[PDB]
């Protein structure tokens, strides 16, 4: 809130643990072209040769 | 009899294809063979041959 | 085997030959004869690192 003002350090330490944590989310986050969209199916295949 | 009978005349027969892969060369037809197939009356039940 | 005592074998009726079990499909890469492989991914894996 406003007692941020008067505690730099605080700040600067909350700054630096979200630096940290985003790049330990980036060196261990999935990464595709697109996600999950399509409803799940599920395909049965049978062959009869002839 | 019966039975055997019933099994073998009632059947769903896997005929093949007149031309299939692997087919020879300029070959030009190409065709699904119906050989036998399951029953569907009574009319045609009671038509089976035993002996 | 026959009355006369020759021995009648598969090569005599038939030709064996190492084929295919799926002759119904003909894959070409520029006009050359090809095969492929899809490969789907995980859930949760990393597509570049992958
Ligand atoms: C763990 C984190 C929670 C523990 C810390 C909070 C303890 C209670 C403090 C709230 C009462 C303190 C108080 O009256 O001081 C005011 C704080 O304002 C308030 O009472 C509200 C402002 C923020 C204080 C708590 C509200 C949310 C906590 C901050 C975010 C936490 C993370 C959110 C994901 C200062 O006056 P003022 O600042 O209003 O000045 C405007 C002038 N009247
Ligand atoms: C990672 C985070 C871990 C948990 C966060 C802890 C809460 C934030 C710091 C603690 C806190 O509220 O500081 C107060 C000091 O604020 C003050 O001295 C008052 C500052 C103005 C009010 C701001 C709202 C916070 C209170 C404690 O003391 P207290 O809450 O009793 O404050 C009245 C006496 N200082
Ligand atoms: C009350 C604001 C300081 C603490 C914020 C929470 C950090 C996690």
Same mark, same amino acid.
Request: glycine share 8%.
């Given at each position: 809130?406003?007692?941020?003002?008067?505690?730099?350090?605080?700040?600067?330490?909350?700054?630096?643990?979200?630096?940290?944590?985003?790049?330990?989310?980036?060196?261990?986050?999935?990464?595709?072209?697109?996600?999950?969209?399509?409803?799940?199916?599920?395909?049965?295949?049978?062959?009869?040769?002839? | 009899?019966?039975?055997?009978?019933?099994?073998?005349?009632?059947?769903?027969?896997?005929?093949?294809?007149?031309?299939?892969?692997?087919?020879?060369?300029?070959?030009?037809?190409?065709?699904?063979?119906?050989?036998?197939?399951?029953?569907?009356?009574?009319?045609?039940?009671?038509?089976?041959?035993?002996? | 085997?026959?009355?006369?005592?020759?021995?009648?074998?598969?090569?005599?009726?038939?030709?064996?030959?190492?084929?295919?079990?799926?002759?119904?499909?003909?894959?070409?890469?520029?006009? +050359?004869?090809?095969?492929?492989?899809?490969? +789907?991914?995980?859930?949760?894996?990393?597509?570049?690192?992958?």
């Amino acid at each position: 809130a406003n007692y941020f003002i008067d505690r730099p350090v605080f700040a600067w330490v909350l700054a630096i643990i979200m630096m940290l944590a985003g790049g330990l989310a980036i060196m261990n986050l999935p990464v595709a072209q697109y996600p999950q969209i399509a409803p799940p199916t599920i395909t049965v295949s049978a062959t009869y040769p002839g | 009899d019966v039975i055997s009978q019933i099994k073998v005349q009632n059947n769903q027969i896997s005929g093949g294809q007149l031309g299939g892969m692997p087919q020879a060369a300029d070959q030009q037809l190409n065709a699904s063979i119906i050989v036998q197939t399951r029953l569907q009356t009574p009319e045609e039940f009671g038509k089976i041959l035993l002996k | 085997v026959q009355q006369d005592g020759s021995q009648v074998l598969l090569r005599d009726v038939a030709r064996v030959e190492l084929g295919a079990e799926d002759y119904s499909t003909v894959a070409r890469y520029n006009g +050359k004869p090809a095969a492929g492989i899809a490969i +789907k991914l995980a859930a949760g894996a990393n597509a570049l690192d992958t």
